[PDB]
Design a protein around this ligand. Structure first.
Ligand SMILES: c1ccc2c(-c3cnn4cc(-c5ccc(N6CCNCC6)cc5)cnc34)ccnc2c1
Lengths: 320, 109
C-alpha cells in the first residue's frame, strides 16, 4: 500500500513514470477528495487521500480534455522523473456526461508553492540558494534533451511562476503545471501575463526555433529569483513578499498593462538598496538582470544559472 | 459477447470460480493489438488484486476473469467499449484500442 514503494516497484520494471496503468485506473473511485488547495492551468487542484496518504489531484472537466491529455503525456514521458519535477502518480476518470471529471494525480506538498512559502517565512542565504538552485535544476532538466534508446526531448515550460513551483519538506523545489509545455519535435501568447517576456507579450517570439520557448522561460525564471531574493534577510532587514511588477501594474494585469511596462518602457523589478550592501544579494541581482534581458539571445541559459548558483553555494560553504 | 473473447492457454482447476465480492489475485501482461506491451505485473514480480463487482477495472476484465478457474491462464481480447473507449489513456492506450491481456488467475481471497 505504501505509495512511494508502489511507484518504486513499478518504475523499476520500466517505461512509465507513475503507477502501472491498471493500478492508475482504480484510483478515481477510491480517492477521498478533502479540499481545494489551489489552482492549475485549466483545472482546480485538490488534496485527496488514497489509502490514507495525502496526494494532490488536478481536476479537469471534459471541455479541457485536451489539456489533461497533454499534461499527463508530458508527466509520463521517459526519463522525465526527477527530484525537481513534481512527482506524477496517476491519471484516471470519474463521473458522468457533462459532469465527467479527469484527474491528474501527483505528490502533495504541504508547504504549498513558492508563493505560499515566501509569504510564510523569511530566508537566509542558504535557504535562498537551496530554493533557487533546486528550482533551476528542475528547469534545466526540462530544457535538456537526454539520449537513450527511449529518449527525453528538450522541453520548454511556458507558464513559469512562483505559484507553479512547490516547496518540499526538505526546503527544495519541484516544478509543476506542464499543460502548456512544448517538446522539441502552438499559440505564442499563452501563460500568465505578469511573467510573459516582451516577445511573448507582443507576439514577436520567433516560432521558427524551439529555442525561443526556452529563452522565454529564462526571463520568467529571472522574475522568480527576484521574488525569492526579497525574502532573504541581510543586515537584520528583509522585504515583504511581493509578486513581480506589484508596484507597476494591477493584480490580474492585462496584456495592455504588461505591454506598456515591459515592451515599451522596458522596466524591470527594482532592487531594494540594502542588496548592494551584501555580496550574495549583489550577485543574485546580477543573475536576475542577466536572465531577464530584453534580447532573448542575451539571456543566461538554465545550465549557466545552475552553475552560477552552485558556485555561490560552495562559496559560502553551503551544500547544494 | 464478441466484445470479450476468452482463449484458454493453460487450464485451471475448473471448480473454484470468482464470486461477486471476492478479491481476485492475478498476473497479467497487457498489449495493444499490434503487440506493444504497456503493463505487466510479471515484470514487477507483484501480483495484482481486484474485487469482482467493485468496477475497479475495465468491464472486459471483470467479464473475462469472472469466467476463469483458479489456476487458469487465458488470452483476453477486449474491444474498446469494454476497455478505455474513445478516450484511451494519455501516452499509453490510443483511442478505440482493442487490447490483449494474458491473464492468470492465481488465487481468490
Ligand atoms: C500547479 C501548482 C501545484 C500543483 C499541484 C500541487 C501539488 N502540491 N500542492 C500543494 C498545494 C498547496 C499546499 C498547501 C498550501 N498551504 C500551506 C499552508 N497554508 C497556506 C496554503 C497551499 C498550496 C497546491 N498545489 C499543489 C498538483 C498538480 N498540479 C499543480 C499545478
Amino acid at each position: 500500500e505504501s505509495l512511494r514503494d508502489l511507484i518504486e516497484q513499478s518504475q523499476s520494471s520500466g517505461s512509465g513514470s507513475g503507477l502501472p496503468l491498471l493500478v492508475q485506473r482504480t484510483i478515481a473511485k477510491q480517492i477521498q477528495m478533502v479540499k481545494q488547495i489551489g489552482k492549475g492551468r485549466y483545472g482546480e487542484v485538490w488534496m485527496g487521500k488514497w489509502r490514507g496518504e495525502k496526494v494532490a489531484v488536478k481536476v479537469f472537466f471534459t471541455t479541457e480534455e485536451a489539456s489533461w491529455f497533454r499534461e499527463t503525456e508530458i508527466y509520463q514521458t521517459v526519463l522525465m522523473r526527477h527530484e525537481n519535477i513534481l512527482g506524477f502518480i496517476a491519471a484516471d476518470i470519474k463521473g458522468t456526461g457533462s459532469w465527467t471529471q479527469l484527474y491528474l494525480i501527483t505528490d502533495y506538498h504541504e508547504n504549498g508553492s513558492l508563493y505560499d512559502y515566501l509569504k510564510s517565512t523569511t530566508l537566509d542565504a542558504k535557504s535562498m540558494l537551496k530554493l533557487a538552485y533546486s528550482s533551476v535544476s528542475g528547469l534545466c532538466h526540462l530544457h535538456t534533451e537526454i539520449f537513450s534508446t527511449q529518449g527525453k526531448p528538450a522541453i520548454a515550460h511556458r507558464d513559469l511562476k512562483s505559484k507553479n513551483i512547490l516547496v518540499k519538506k526538505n526546503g527544495t523545489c519541484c516544478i509543476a503545471d506542464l499543460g502548456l509545455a512544448v517538446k522539441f519535435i502552438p499559440n505564442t501568447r499563452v501563460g500568465t501575463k505578469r511573467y510573459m517576456p516582451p516577445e511573448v507579450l507582443d507576439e514577436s517570439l520567433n516560432r521558427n526555433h524551439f529555442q525561443s520557448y526556452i529563452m522565454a522561460d529564462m526571463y520568467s525564471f529571472g522574475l522568480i529569483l527576484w521574488e525569492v531574493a526579497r525574502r532573504c534577510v541581510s543586515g537584520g532587514i528583509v522585504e515583504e513578499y511581493q509578486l513581480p511588477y506589484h508596484d507597476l501594474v494591477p493584480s490580474d494585469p492585462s496584456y495592455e498593462d504588461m505591454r506598456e511596462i515591459v515592451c515599451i518602457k522596458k522596466l524591470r523589478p527594482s532592487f531594494p538598496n540594502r542588496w548592494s550592501s551584501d555580496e550574495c544579494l549583489r550577485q543574485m541581482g546580477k543573475l536576475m538582470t542577466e536572465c531577464w534581458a530584453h534580447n532573448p539571445a542575451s539571456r543566461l541559459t538554465a545550465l549557466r544559472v545552475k552553475k552560477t548558483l552552485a558556485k555561490m553555494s560552495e562559496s559560502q560553504d553551503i551544500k547544494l | 459477447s464478441m466484445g470479450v473473447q476468452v482463449e484458454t492457454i493453460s487450464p485451471g482447476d475448473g471448480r473454484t470460480f470468482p464470486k461477486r465480492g471476492q478479491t481476485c489475485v492475478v498476473h497479467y501482461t497487457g498489449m495493444l493489438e499490434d503487440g506493444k506491451k504497456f503493463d505487466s505485473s510479471r515484470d514487477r514480480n507483484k501480483p495484482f488484486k481486484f474485487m469482482l463487482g467493485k468496477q475497479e477495472v475495465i468491464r472486459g476484465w471483470e467479464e473475462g476473469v469472472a469466467q476463469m478457474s483458479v489456476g487458469q491462464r487465458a488470452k483476453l481480447t477486449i474491444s474498446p467499449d469494454y476497455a478505455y473507449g474513445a478516450t484511451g489513456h494519455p501516452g499509453i492506450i490510443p483511442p478505440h484500442a482493442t487490447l490483449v491481456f494474458d491473464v492468470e488467475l492465481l488465487k481468490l481471497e
